[PDB]
Design a protein around this ligand. Structure first.
Ligand SMILES: Nc1ncnc2c1ncn2[C@@H]1O[C@H](COP(=O)(O)OP(=O)(O)O)[C@@H](O)[C@H]1O
Ligand SMILES: [Mg+2]
Length: 279
């Protein structure tokens, strides 16, 4: 599909840089016609076939197709798309309160502060999985807060660069994210489905409760090995006054066999809740 090929600067003014990827840079911007603010994500296109730099058109089209389907309080929405010879430019909903990642670097969290965040993440993922969309890159840097300076911040899931529609219950190959957060089936290059997201949620939950990463090794390869082996434990020093139900929630997500892992629907009914790979 093609996108609007007018100069984006004719319609938007750009401001501060909000964030950076290997092939993307995200800048605050303001639409001239409405004065509304957005985040413009500039994704570098492939310059050839078989070039390693930039993102393939097929991959950019998939990210755009998925973003266009989304409208939910806990996910990002897509406003407009532009393109030119070098970039595709996604005008995304602005999330102005920073990464959950940097929020956690400031603040440990109480179990209630952890569940406040987690319930919203689970609601956003329930929405996506209801659509058969696997996000495949869930981690604290890809959660954003609308406002950091409130006692119970609202979050939106961002970064659909690895997301895929799963229309057969699994897809074959193999959308490798960040070693600390990827499920064993990603590590082992096995068919992947919605369950891989649920593993990432267990990793995120462990970190929210402890400030520590459950599988992190000294090298990317050692982390990957730890993940495949399900090499983690609840350190007394971090978890001694965490509730057993919170540990139970994590244990049921950090399960090697995706068939045996909690589903997003299971996770919402759980008693605790129910009311870049190579060095
Ligand atoms: N809608 C948004 N609002 C505010 N900041 C954003 C938004 N989207 C992305 N960012 C920031 O930009 C960074 C990179 O964007 P991302 O979508 O993760 O691109 P990629 O992971 O493909 O490089 C994020 O980690 C975040 O800090
Ligand atoms: Mg990111």
């Amino acid at each position: 599909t093609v996108f609007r090929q007018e100069n984006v600067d004719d319609y938007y003014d750009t401001g501060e840089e909000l964030g950076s990827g290997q092939f993307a840079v995200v800048k605050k911007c303001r639409e001239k016609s409405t004065g509304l603010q957005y985040a413009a994500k500039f994704i570098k296109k492939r310059r050839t076939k078989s070039s390693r730099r930039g993102v393939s058109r097929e991959d950019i089209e998939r990210e755009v197709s998925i973003l266009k389907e989304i409208q939910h309080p806990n996910v990002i929405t897509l406003h407009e798309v532009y393109e030119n010879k070098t970039d595709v430019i996604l005008i995304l909903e602005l999330v102005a309160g920073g990464e959950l990642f940097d929020f956690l670097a400031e603040k440990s969290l109480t179990e209630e502060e952890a569940t406040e965040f987690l319930k919203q993440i689970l609601n956003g993922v329930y929405y996506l999985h209801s659509l058969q969309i696997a996000h495949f890159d869930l981690k604290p840097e890809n959660i954003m807060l609308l406002d950091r300076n409130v006692p119970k911040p609202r979050i939106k899931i961002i970064d659909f660069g690895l997301a895929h529609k799963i229309d057969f219950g699994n897809e074959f190959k193999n959308i490798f994210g960040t070693p600390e957060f990827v499920a064993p089936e990603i590590v082992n290059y096995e068919p992947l489905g919605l369950e891989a997201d649920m593993w990432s949620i267990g990793v995120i939950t462990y970190i929210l409760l402890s400030g520590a990463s459950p599988f992190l090794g000294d090298t990317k390869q050692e982390t990957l090995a730890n993940v495949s082996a399900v090499n983690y434990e609840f350190e007394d020093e971090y978890f001694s006054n965490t509730s057993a139900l919170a540990k139970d929630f994590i244990r049921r997500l950090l399960v090697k066999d995706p068939k045996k892992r909690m589903t997003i629907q299971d996770s919402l009914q759980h008693p605790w809740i129910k009311p870049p790979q190579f060095e």
